[PDB]
Amino acid sequence: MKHHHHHHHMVSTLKPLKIGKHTIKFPIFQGGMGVGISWDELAGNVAKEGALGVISAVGTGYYKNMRFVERIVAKKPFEALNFYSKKALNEIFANARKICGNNPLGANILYAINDYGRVLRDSCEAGANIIITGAGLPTNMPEFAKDFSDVALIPIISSAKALKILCKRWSDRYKRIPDAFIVEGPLSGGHQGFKYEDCFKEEFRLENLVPKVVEASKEWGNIPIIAAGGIWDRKDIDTMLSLGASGVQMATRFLGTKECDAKVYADLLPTLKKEDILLIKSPVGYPARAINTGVIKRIEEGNAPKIACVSNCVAPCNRGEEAKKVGYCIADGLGRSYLGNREEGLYFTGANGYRVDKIISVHELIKELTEG
Numbered sequence: 429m430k431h432h433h434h435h436h437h438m439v440s441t442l443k444p445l446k447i448g449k450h451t452i453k454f455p456i457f458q459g460g461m462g463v464g465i466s467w468d469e470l471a472g473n474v475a476k477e478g479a480l481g482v483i484s485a486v487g488t489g490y491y492k493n494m495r496f497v498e499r500i501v502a503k504k505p506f507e508a509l510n511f512y513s514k515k516a517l518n519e520i521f522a523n524a525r526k527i528c529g530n531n532p533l534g535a536n537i538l539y540a541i542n543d544y545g546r547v548l549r550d551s552c553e554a555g556a557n558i559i560i561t562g563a564g565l566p567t568n569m570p571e572f573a574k575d576f577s578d579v580a581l582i583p584i585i586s587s588a589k590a591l592k593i594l595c596k597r598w599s600d601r602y603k604r605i606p607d608a609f610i611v612e613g614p615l616s617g618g619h620q621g622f623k624y625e626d627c628f629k630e631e632f633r634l635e636n637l638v639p640k641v642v643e644a645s646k647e648w649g650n651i652p653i654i655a656a657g658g659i660w661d662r663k664d665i666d667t668m669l670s671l672g673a674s675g676v677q678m679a680t681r682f683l684g685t686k687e688c689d690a691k692v693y694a695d696l697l698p699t700l701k702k703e704d705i706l707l708i709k710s711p712v713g714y715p716a717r718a719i720n721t722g723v724i725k726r727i728e729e730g731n732a733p734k735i736a737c738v739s740n741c742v743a744p745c746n747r748g749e750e751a752k753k754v755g756y757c758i759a760d761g762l763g764r765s766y767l768g769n770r771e772e773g774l775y776f777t778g779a780n781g782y783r784v785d786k787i788i789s790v791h792e793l794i795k796e797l798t799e800g
């Protein structure tokens with residue numbers, strides 16, 4: 429009909445997904461994306477379409493060019509209190525709800541942080557239905573959630589081993605177990621939960637990981653398993669569901685939508701070639717998949733931005749130690765990209781980023797992924 433709109437019906441054979449007390453109409457999460465990539469426009473429109481919109485809680489101090497920070501040094505949010513800004517996260521959630529209303533929303537918060545519990549509690553207070561946490565083994569998420577018993581809790585893992593450990597440790601100390609698990613494979617965007625040399629080993633392809641995680645989940649009552657990393661279209665979704673996943677998490681396709689809150693990607697992705705997608709070191713301590721542009725090119729030229737830890741974004745870096753060793757500050761680079769700086773920004777992508785040709789709307793994307 430040329431153009432399908434929000435008043436238009438659509439038939440799907442995908443089934444609604446229950447995560448804790450929350451139901452989403454389609455078994456699809458839009459993966460959280462920092463810094464400033466999945467905020468109110470992206471996540472609110474995803475949730476409007478009946479998938480899980482996920483607000484990234486990382487680097488919210490950059491929102492609206494540090495509208496909600498108390499102190500700025502060298503155009504950066506000062507310390508973790510301002511880098512993970514409570515007021516900004518509150519405004520981002522409120523603005524997403526103007527679009528999606530009470531439709532469920534997640535908040536994504538990396539475990540490797542100073543202040544993890546504070547940011548989790550902030551996300552709950554901002555109205556998140558679901559907390560999603562990777563980049564670490566999040567054995568204590570219920571510690572910080574106990575005043576918000578409706579919020580569902582979802583660790584991101586990269587092995588069946590981690591599922592077993594997390595369930596044991598949660599069950600023993602909180603008499604609770606996770607509401608779902610996301611298993612993230614090595615074709616994903618952002619940071620990988622694998623050493624570099626394991627990111628190319630067939631052992632660790634997502635289709636091998638999913639059955640193992642689903643099997644481990646059986647002992648604990650068939651906790652829903654969400655497959656993530658390299659899922660591009662409905663064919664890949666169906667493959668993962670047929671392997672026992674209850675749903676999928678997808679990010680790179682949404683990075684290529686109009687509603688993405690980091691507007692640079694709409695310019696950058698249509699030009700992106702596969703040869704310019706690489707795995708680089710990160711001050712977070714896991715490999716990161718990046719676009720060979722911006723600060724990465726400036727480092728090679730010997731023009732790298734100066735490093736001085738202002739935002740104190742992640743504990744493994746030790747206030748700049750690791751940033752200086754790997755050559756860049758991830759907070760500074762991602763914030764610059766959100767602010768539109770093509771020369772010194774840092775840009776991330778899944779392995780599939782080169783397949784983005786046209787920038788489409790979230791509505792059109794969900795229609796593509798769910799029809800039939």
Ligand SMILES: Cc1cc2nc3c(=O)[nH]c(=O)nc-3n(C[C@H](O)[C@H](O)[C@H](O)COP(=O)(O)O)c2cc1C
Binds near residue numbers: 459462679779
């Ligand atoms: C640009 C970008 C930024 C990301 N940032 C985060 C992040 O901050 N936290 C996180 O848990 N995952 C992050 N991810 C991972 C995604 O949420 C998702 O799990 C993954 O990219 C899915 O693989 P796909 O991109 O091939 O669909 C990011 C991914 C991309 C592409």
Ligand SMILES: CN(C)c1cccc(NS(=O)(=O)c2nnc(NC(=O)c3cccc(Br)c3)s2)c1
Binds near residue numbers: 563612712758
């Ligand atoms: C150990 N372990 C389960 C583990 C390890 C690595 C990846 C995963 N998979 S993942 O949690 O989905 C993520 N992928 N990319 C991420 N990026 C960020 O957190 C981040 C993004 C932007 C700024 C900043 Br400062 C941090 S987090 C799991």
Ligand code: SF4
Binds near residue numbers: 741747
């Ligand atoms: S120097 Fe390290 S801890 Fe400080 S903001 Fe940059 S990457 Fe984060």
